Structure 1
Amino acid sequence: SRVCQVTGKRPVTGNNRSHALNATKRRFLPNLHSHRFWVESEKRFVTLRVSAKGMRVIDKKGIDTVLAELRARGEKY
């Protein structure tokens, strides 16, 4: 599914609104990218499907802290 493994961002629903205010249902998808993250503690690459936002979280917190959070949830990688 289109779910960020770091943040849990997923598709949300809302409306397209025309100039005449016609509402049609749409989705907003996360900006997801499969990315190979270097885990220097483990000396290997871990691939995560992450939002661009999730990538900024990894930059801020570090991959070790993030993977520990994933292990606590039971999110496997």
Structure 2
Amino acid sequence: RRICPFTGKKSNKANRVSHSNHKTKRLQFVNLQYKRVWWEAGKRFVKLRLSTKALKTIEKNGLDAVAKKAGIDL
């Protein structure tokens, strides 16, 4: 799925209004993204899939907090 493990950031249901006001449907989705963050508690990288907001959050709040608040590792 395209759902951030660490926050339920789903895509957004949003219609793209045109200039004549013609509304299509245009599903709109997060920039969750393949990286590999360095889980210190194992001295070792893990490969994740991260909504950038959640990436900022781990850094601000550390990683393991994010972990238990979503219960993800291993």
Question: 1:34–1:48: 8 Å Cα contact kept in structure 2?
Answer: yes
Number of aligned residue pairs: give it: 74
1:70 positional shift:
2.3
More strand by share: 1
- For residues 6 and 55 of structure 2, the distance between their equivalents in structure 1, rounded to whole angstroms, comes to 8
Where does residue 10 of structure 1 map in the other structure? 10
Note the aligned Cα RMSD (angstroms). Answer: 1.4
List per-residue Cα deviations over 1:9-51 (Å, max 9, x = no partner).
1112111111110111111110111111111122211221111
4+ runs deviating over 4 angstroms: none
Unaligned runs of at least 5 residues, structure 1: none
- Calculate the TM-score normalised by the size of structure 2: 0.87
TM superposition score normalised by structure 1: 0.84
Q: Using the aligned pairs only, state the percent identity.
A: 39
Kindly provide the amino acid, as one letter, of the partner of residue 13 in structure 2. T
Assess if the C-alpha contact under 8 Å between 2:31 and 2:52 holds in 1.
yes
